[PDB]
Design a protein around this ligand. Structure first.
Ligand SMILES: Cc1cc2c(cc1C)N(C[C@H](O)[C@H](O)[C@H](O)COP(=O)(O)OP(=O)(O)OC[C@H]1O[C@@H](n3cnc4c(N)ncnc43)[C@H](O)[C@@H]1O)c1[nH]c(=O)[nH]c(=O)c1N2
Ligand SMILES: Cc1cc2c(cc1C)N(C[C@H](O)[C@H](O)[C@H](O)COP(=O)(O)OP(=O)(O)OC[C@H]1O[C@@H](n3cnc4c(N)ncnc43)[C@H](O)[C@@H]1O)c1[nH]c(=O)[nH]c(=O)c1N2
Ligand SMILES: Cc1cc2c(cc1C)N(C[C@H](O)[C@H](O)[C@H](O)COP(=O)(O)OP(=O)(O)OC[C@H]1O[C@@H](n3cnc4c(N)ncnc43)[C@H](O)[C@@H]1O)c1[nH]c(=O)[nH]c(=O)c1N2
Ligand SMILES: Cc1cc2c(cc1C)N(C[C@H](O)[C@H](O)[C@H](O)COP(=O)(O)OP(=O)(O)OC[C@H]1O[C@@H](n3cnc4c(N)ncnc43)[C@H](O)[C@@H]1O)c1[nH]c(=O)[nH]c(=O)c1N2
Ligand SMILES: NC(=O)c1ccc[n+]([C@@H]2O[C@H](COP(=O)([O-])OP(=O)(O)OC[C@H]3O[C@@H](n4cnc5c(N)ncnc54)[C@H](OP(=O)(O)O)[C@@H]3O)[C@@H](O)[C@H]2O)c1
Ligand SMILES: NC(=O)c1ccc[n+]([C@@H]2O[C@H](COP(=O)([O-])OP(=O)(O)OC[C@H]3O[C@@H](n4cnc5c(N)ncnc54)[C@H](OP(=O)(O)O)[C@@H]3O)[C@@H](O)[C@H]2O)c1
Ligand SMILES: NC(=O)c1ccc[n+]([C@@H]2O[C@H](COP(=O)([O-])OP(=O)(O)OC[C@H]3O[C@@H](n4cnc5c(N)ncnc54)[C@H](OP(=O)(O)O)[C@@H]3O)[C@@H](O)[C@H]2O)c1
Ligand SMILES: [Br-]
Ligand SMILES: [Br-]
Ligand SMILES: [Br-]
Ligand SMILES: [Br-]
Ligand SMILES: [Br-]
Ligand SMILES: [Br-]
Ligand SMILES: [Br-]
Ligand SMILES: [Br-]
Ligand SMILES: [Br-]
Ligand SMILES: [Br-]
Ligand SMILES: [Br-]
Ligand SMILES: [Br-]
Ligand SMILES: [Br-]
Ligand SMILES: [Br-]
Ligand SMILES: [Br-]
Ligand SMILES: [Br-]
Ligand SMILES: [Br-]
Ligand SMILES: [Br-]
Ligand SMILES: [Br-]
Ligand SMILES: [Br-]
Ligand SMILES: [Br-]
Ligand SMILES: [Br-]
Ligand SMILES: [Br-]
Ligand SMILES: [Br-]
Ligand SMILES: [Br-]
Ligand SMILES: [Br-]
Ligand SMILES: [Br-]
Ligand SMILES: [Br-]
Ligand SMILES: [Br-]
Ligand SMILES: [Br-]
Ligand SMILES: [Br-]
Lengths: 414, 414, 415, 414
């Protein structure tokens, strides 16, 4: 049995794809595979006060269909919270609530996702021309293979550690913060270093300050202070559906300009309110004569070693041009992520995929990889399109339209 | 041809009723009569910067049906302004845009509304007990009559002038502000008095200040300064549909408590931002050495007379306990409105309508007037229920649910 | 040794006064008596996040002297926090910081305040007409009497419990919340009722929510929800120095209008940010499926009794018009305060103080009590002037000007 | 008569110097020369709604002396506007008010500034080593020379036009906008192009939009939309006096990091409120069906020519890598400024001043130019220290401390 489309991974991107498929009048068969036991949307960073970075209007479907049964508003309504929510006058739900929104949408779906199912490889199906791919799925029981005309790869961002630093028992990447943190002894983390100057770093430092009154925190970052995230209406336009076209059709020079001027809409920056809350906390501690937040500015973490009961963090100071050591209990690296890269999954097929001069994957406007003529199957990317489609690639800004264009593309070809 | 329901007036309340009728699976016949040529939603006060006092989520239908084709979001989408709107991160549309929303919703409707049609009386149909009512409609050419099993009266708020003051060519009620203003010679309104301390008074003063750089304005109000409108999330819960119950089922003592603590949510109060804008304007004028805004606090307007080229306003000062005259070109009375009273329209029918101890109409929870067995046809009120249903009666807070409850009620009895 | 002026109590008002005395070129002798061991400014309510309700510009002196050594700005500078503070862009200091500001100002003063000194009575001095008063001061060791040509009474607001409810081991007035709370065992305050819909009530409920995540709280108040405090610029003008004139010279009618329209600038109301924080808290608990905040609206606490291990709170519901019992661990009554009353302290001198029709003290514009000719000794009130001077009387809005006007009055009358 | 110190220019920087001199117990003689007839602080850009970018606490003296007779608070008090101002709860005065503050401070000063006096050169005084400088001052009547042991150069930012574009009758630099705007006839500026994406460009566009209702405006800028200014509390720390030290003592690596991460605090960025107001204006025009603001993003102005009665602006589009002509009435170039150059008055003395490797003036922390032993007189810079002291140089953030440090330095060496 050969499916019209198979989705690899089940985060928000393929969820919105599933929703788009259901709402389309086109009769398309599909299967989705998620390695984890259920939807798990950055649970390691589901901190108490964490808030979405996208407006509730930017949900699974609303921008494409303003009367979707899968809209965030529909979800508030069935939960009996729409009125309460509207009273609050906040365009930004909590991460906690949005996570519930995802699970609610998944349940509503007619079709069933296959959990505990890791896709291990994608191989060319039989014959010429190649009209199908073979998808190798590993369950905890048994391995198997499914066949599909089209495949949609949406496996998410990949944690990135500082060069020369490896994750270990007392060294964590931010993505795994709560998983480690909930599993400690509550008074065996009196000294924590957090590396990074982005949203993750800021939220973790905030949480630590708010959690235990006696934790001392070292916030280590290359800038002189947190840099504000730009979420003013015009800059935010780069996430408009039409701005995808502008980036896509634009020259390399124009693409560079988007990054030069507007990377501060998302990368290595912190939300205004979180910055102000941290600043207020620092100020009040100073007034109380009990400083706890140590901001190590203009600096990078360059190494970590466990020495007896201490995690020894090597810090490079850009001001002094020298390195030194800080001793803590745990090092949290909030040092960001690498883009989704379909390559590692593609091993058979990658040689049917065209690269550009700088060796990156060519991708069509409709998120479809560029292939050899012998490949006729569709390979679509949700994620990993930073270089072709722009800053919206890893974000929640454009779920409805992106998923819709992919579904239309697939239909247009069947 | 006897209609299931006839709507008198076509403002937002009956519009939402029309929408509720179309979305209901119940097959109900209806007709709507509006005395004006088209939807005309306080156009006299459609000032340049005027904002809705209610969230865009509080539209014609969303609270009842979160995926209505008549939602504000659907409107934005069809106009191609949903993305732009979301980027603004403002819950409050402009009055101008909301007016366009109403006209858009009216056009989408399958039913056609009858314009230029004034309802002049409502009479008992032929029968005992009465199973229908007759509805007299006057058009420019003819007069006719319509028979209905239910009526819904939604005529509006009635302009109220100060005691002992009659409107005039030089003495305007705020409701007609732009009708008189528009084409009045600019060089002829150098001195304007505005009576009142509410949202209407504040917006008019602001507009005058913004629009002619030489007008001198006297803002006359009983308070020592504008009182802020309470729109904090808890107080705003009095407009929750569950709060309608809470008022309705509550004792007279409880009802009085709503008004004594929370009338500040709507009556005789001014929006925070409008207050601050006025204050900023006054401050800057002082800095510039050119005061323009004269605030006559602890005061009321008690009379007006035209004397040669001057409108002479008699002001009573509470502080001094005396009266004095103030000469201006025009007096604008932003002195508020009276609730909608169905009584005039009913005439003949009033007698089968039950009153309470204090002489007020009794109304069931579903907005249906209490009648004597002599009457079995339904008379519903959208407006004029301040005493029975509470502060939401004249407002836009609860359109979707009240219209829905009325439609359900009519279907239930049929 | 007869002093020109004696101050009873040493809160911000009398501190203000001490500052005004020092800055005045007039050579006036003065003594201040405070019952407590040191300045103690509503310490029972010094909660972690508590913020001033008045701008830092409304400090001890700035409105009268823009370049005072006692300004809040000066304080920030000396503490090396002025630059940091400026960057925060908030006009409202924390209560904790403001408390440090007061202590700092007191230390800088050339005068020394007598602490642990309770004023127990004020008596007519010798002779007629009375040219001085005698101030009875009780210390832990001894008792003594001092003599003064003028006296300034500034003893502060007085806690007010609900009628028919008495403070106790398990029934606290908000003013003493942290006093009691810091003593009790955490696992023993699982159930708390808080009565009131004002700033105190709201702050206490937020603190409980934020500081113990398994505490259940019942917020009992007469309104349908918290009412917002009006702090918009025009309404705030009622606290302007000139508005004190406007209230004072105005008829009863106009005085009543101030209260009818603008009592919501201060009484029985809650700051916008605190309301939204509480609302956010409730919302997030509902999402998590773990409700903890129970808002009991349109209601009054009418009684409390201890029954075994439970504090039984009798609540009257206005909606239903019945009463019922609610069991908790502690009842906190955030039910407000009564105005300062110079009455009790005055005793005999009250005979020489003139009352109005409704039996209240007559007070001149300069805060001096109206007296018969048999008394020429100045009695000034900082507090307790709500009926003559208006809503600024118990607040921090007008410290600089009021203190300055009292000092000027005293000096104008010395000669 | 040899002065201890001579100030060239009398803007806020030297004004704070004059104040610092008067408050210092040191008896130092001084003279100040200003080319203009009076204090003239960017009057070309004194637009109606223009706000300070710096807090009122950052005034001429307060950070140094919290109880200065020259504080902004003292100013408000004398003008009887301290109470009113505090009620507003806005840290940012208007530019108009601040200008009045300057003039007020200048009048209070005991010292008398010499206006209409343009410094044309600074030359070494007699014999070696030079112990004084000679300052050539040109008045409308005559030219004279004064002698001084120290000199403070504070001549301000220098307007910078685009490469290939010259100011003219219909091509204006933003600095002269009001001077130019005012003579013109309203009916003659129906089409205006404004180049730039910074605070100047944004304010000018907003003013045009607000001041005429028919003007069509082309906003031409290299970014995809306005970039928000970073004004969050850690970011404002860059301007702390203690941060001057951090920048000064830091390596060249560290210095680069300040600019890389935090130039957005000031350069090529727009205040949050101004951005939202422009966005609101664009939105309402679209609703009204009358678009007037044309945002020409990802673009540069590269030439201008007058052709009959139009100004032909050549625009380069990065997106299309192409240029085209845009015809208008006036081109306003809001393309920024070039930092103060100590060097152009310096002439011969420049031989005795030390450059570094990249050819830049060496400057001591106390703002004094590094000289050979042949020069012993002090040359101080307020402005032109971007390289050595950082982003605070042209700004108002640090007037009190900078002026105080310079006064102390001069006293110390005397
Ligand atoms: C803490 C935090 C918070 C946010 C964000 C990031 C982070 C780190 N983001 C960005 C983030 O990229 C976005 O929110 C989504 O996670 C993107 O959804 P995806 O479907 O692309 O992948 P997603 O990252 O959700 O995961 C895809 C799934 O594929 C699975 N998978 C991987 N390999 C597989 C295999 N071989 N076989 C089967 N399954 C496999 C993974 O297990 C995973 O569940 C964000 N952006 C924004 O615009 N607004 C926001 O609020 C946030 N919030
Ligand atoms: C300037 C201004 C602005 C606002 C508001 C009021 C005012 C004065 N309001 C309140 C206002 O009542 C509400 O917005 C609606 O107008 C109420 O709808 P009805 O449909 O109930 O009245 P209206 O909307 O007043 O409906 C009445 C209609 O009936 C017609 N009519 C009257 N008599 C008739 C007859 N005999 N025969 C036929 N037709 C007849 C009238 O022509 C009119 O069109 C408000 N509230 C809120 O919550 N948010 C807001 O933003 C605003 N905005
Ligand atoms: C929790 C809280 C918080 C605030 C406020 C109230 C409360 C309850 N207030 C109002 C308050 O009234 C004001 O801040 C000061 O307390 C008033 O100064 P007095 O100096 O008038 O009172 P207090 O400040 O009450 O001064 C009275 C002193 O006299 C002493 N005393 C009493 N009897 C004595 C005796 N017989 N002998 C000697 N000493 C005696 C007392 O011990 C006390 O120290 C306020 N207002 C505002 O405008 N902004 C704000 O931010 C706040 N904050
Ligand atoms: C529209 C606008 C608005 C602002 C700002 C810039 C602009 C363009 N700035 C930055 C600006 O640099 C600052 O406000 C001051 O103008 C700097 O003072 P100087 O005293 O340093 O320059 P400034 O230009 O003010 O003074 C220079 C003076 O020297 C005179 N002069 C030059 N050469 C001379 C000679 N040879 N002989 C005699 N006189 C001579 C000039 O005539 C001029 O009066 C700012 N920054 C900030 O932090 N917050 C803010 O709000 C603003 N606002
Ligand atoms: N509440 C939410 O919804 C939420 C929460 C967290 C994250 N997110 C999202 O997750 C995505 C990624 O955010 P992120 O914060 O996790 O990463 P970033 O990629 O946004 O964070 C990286 C930061 O660490 C710094 N860094 C790199 N190497 C370092 C080193 N050796 N030592 C110290 N610091 C170092 C970076 O500096 P430089 O880049 O300058 O070199 C940068 O400041 C974003 O889209 C973000 O919005 C969302
Ligand atoms: N951060 C700060 O600076 C801070 C903090 C706390 C307080 N304060 C100040 O101190 C002053 C007083 O504030 P406050 O909140 O302490 O007291 P408050 O303003 O007088 O409020 C008292 C409240 O209790 C209610 N109440 C009275 N009896 C009740 C009963 N039997 N049951 C339930 N509720 C009852 C009152 O309702 P009704 O009046 O409607 O009947 C009112 O809501 C104010 O000036 C205030 O701003 C300042
Ligand atoms: N209210 C106030 O107090 C106020 C008002 C105005 C200005 N200021 C201050 O004055 C200083 C300068 O502000 P500013 O806006 O005038 O200067 P600016 O910050 O340098 O802004 C210059 C802008 O023009 C752009 N640009 C340069 N060449 C261009 C070209 N050929 N075509 C199109 N665009 C071009 C720049 O782009 P790129 O940088 O990307 O190259 C930049 O966006 C700041 O300190 C500022 O805050 C204050
Ligand atoms: Br948290
Ligand atoms: Br968004
Ligand atoms: Br709901
Ligand atoms: Br890890
Ligand atoms: Br483009
Ligand atoms: Br689509
Ligand atoms: Br609302
Ligand atoms: Br759209
Ligand atoms: Br009228
Ligand atoms: Br307007
Ligand atoms: Br008048
Ligand atoms: Br009269
Ligand atoms: Br209802
Ligand atoms: Br319903
Ligand atoms: Br707290
Ligand atoms: Br205030
Ligand atoms: Br400081
Ligand atoms: Br107690
Ligand atoms: Br008055
Ligand atoms: Br005074
Ligand atoms: Br000279
Ligand atoms: Br600032
Ligand atoms: Br003043
Ligand atoms: Br030209
Ligand atoms: Br020019
Ligand atoms: Br303007
Ligand atoms: Br550093
Ligand atoms: Br740079
Ligand atoms: Br163009
Ligand atoms: Br400095
Ligand atoms: Br200094």
């Amino acid at each position: 049995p050969t499916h019209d489309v198979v989705g690899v991974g089940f985060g928000p991107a393929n969820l919105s794809l599933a929703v788009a498929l259901e709402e389309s009048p086109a009769a398309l068969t599909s299967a989705f595979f998620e390695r984890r036991a259920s939807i798990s949307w950055h649970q390691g960073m589901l901190l108490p006060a964490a808030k979405m970075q996208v407006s509730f209007l930017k949900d699974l479907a609303t921008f494409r269909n303003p009367a979707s049964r899968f809209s965030f508003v529909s979800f508030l309504h069935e939960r009996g919270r729409l009125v309460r929510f509207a009273n609050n006058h906040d365009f930004f739900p909590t991460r906690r609530e949005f996570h519930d929104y995802l699970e609610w949408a998944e349940s509503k779906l007619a079709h069933e996702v296959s959990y505990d199912s890791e896709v291990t490889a994608i191989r060319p199906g039989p014959g010429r021309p190649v009209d199908s791919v073979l998808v190798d799925v590993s369950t905890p029981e048994a391995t198997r293979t499914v066949e599909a005309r089209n495949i949609v790869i949406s496996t998410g961002l990949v944690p990135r550690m500082p060069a020369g630093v490896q994750s270990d028992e007392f060294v964590w990447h931010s993505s795994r913060f709560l998983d480690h943190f909930r599993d400690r002894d509550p008074r065996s983390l009196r000294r924590v270093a957090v590396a990074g100057g982005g949203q993750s770093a800021a939220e973790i430092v905030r949480f630590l300050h708010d959690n235990r009154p006696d934790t001392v925190v070292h916030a280590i970052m290359p800038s002189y202070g947190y840099v504000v995230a730009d979420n003013t209406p015009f800059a935010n336009q780069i996430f408009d559906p039409a701005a995808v076209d502008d980036y896509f059709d634009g020259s390399k020079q124009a693409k560079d300009a988007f990054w030069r001027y507007h990377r501060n809409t998302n990368y290595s920056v912190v939300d205004d309110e979180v910055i102000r809350d941290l600043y207020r906390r620092g100020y009040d501690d100073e007034v109380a004569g009990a400083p706890r937040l140590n901001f190590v500015n203009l600096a990078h973490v360059v190494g970590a070693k466990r020495i007896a009961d201490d995690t020894r963090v090597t810090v490079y100071s850009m001001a002094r041009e020298e390195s030194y050591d800080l001793d803590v209990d745990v090092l949290v690296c909030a040092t960001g992520y690498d883009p989704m890269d379909p390559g590692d999954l593609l091993g058979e097929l990658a040689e049917h995929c065209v690269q550009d001069a700088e060796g990156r994957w060519q991708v069509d406007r409709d998120y479809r990889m560029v292939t050899t003529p012998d490949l006729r199957c569709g390979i679509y990317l949700q994620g990993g399109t930073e270089h072709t489609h722009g800053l919206s690639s890893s974000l929640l800004s454009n779920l409805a339209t992106r998923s819709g264009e992919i579904v239309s593309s697939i239909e247009r070809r069947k």
